[PDB]
Design a protein around this ligand. Sequence first.
Ligand SMILES: *CCCCCCNC(=O)CN(C)S(=O)(=O)c1ccc(N(C)C)c2nsnc12
Ligand SMILES: [Cl-]
Length: 290
Amino acid sequence: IGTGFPFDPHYVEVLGERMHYVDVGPRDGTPVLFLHGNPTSSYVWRNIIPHVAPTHRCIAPDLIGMGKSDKPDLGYFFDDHVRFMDAFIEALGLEEVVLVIHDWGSALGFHWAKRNPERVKGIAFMEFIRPIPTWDEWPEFARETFQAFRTTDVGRKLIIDQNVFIEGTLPMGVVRPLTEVEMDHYREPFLNPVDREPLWRFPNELPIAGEPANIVALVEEYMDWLHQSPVPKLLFWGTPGVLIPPAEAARLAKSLPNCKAVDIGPGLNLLQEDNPDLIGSEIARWLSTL
Ligand SMILES: *CCCCCCNC(=O)CN(C)S(=O)(=O)c1ccc(N(C)C)c2nsnc12
Ligand SMILES: [Cl-]
């Protein structure tokens, strides 16, 4: 599995800020938009894009405050990302797109697809955001850790000062052992503690046990749309998973209209890091059928 990032930088002005994105492949077709989540960047798609780039345009932005994009002093709430990603998509002059989305990128991708259904010809998704009914279902320490993250005293000392979301939570979401070179690529954006604000805000935005209600409602809305939407779907899942366990994946595979499911094998959250070749190859095959 490749550790390098051999993609030239592209930048565009979005709501007064500069956003970095990968942009490769032919212009004469339908572009594929890749949206990462917390605490990753376009780096998470590095081994998947090369399977799609030969035939389709691949666009992989770094969310505002993350990757190589600018880091303004903001709260970095979900609505803040929604606004920047909206203006990013319009800045590139994109009409119709295929979405490839993960974690908080899935929230952005689904929320966009809901509001712009005519402009979405396909949605490939994996380990995506859904409402979590209770804390009790969480594993012992994961419960303790994320409840702690969702505070201003301990959570900030953990994520901001100690950088545990990068140093601990991130590699714990990969089944295989992430190398130090790969960790360094993920560490790069957050060397300065002040730049770690999005890393702390995202876990506080997670819809867990009704809180926050605004995020829960927003998430509930795009799930309803997805059940009703006849758009083609590709759901990658792994065992035991994290946000999406194997039983939930099989359930949605049957429930969601026009939805092929793919088993990547062993996997937690960053499925891209455990089986990039299968995810990359299957997306390409799936695109050639659309
Ligand atoms: C999608 C945003 C978080 C992804 C960060 C990657 N790291 C992990 O997922 C680490 N996990 C293995 S965890 O042990 O911290 C963990 C365990 C369980 C759950 N759930 C019960 C959903 C979880 N949600 S986020 N991290 C989790
Ligand atoms: Cl998070």
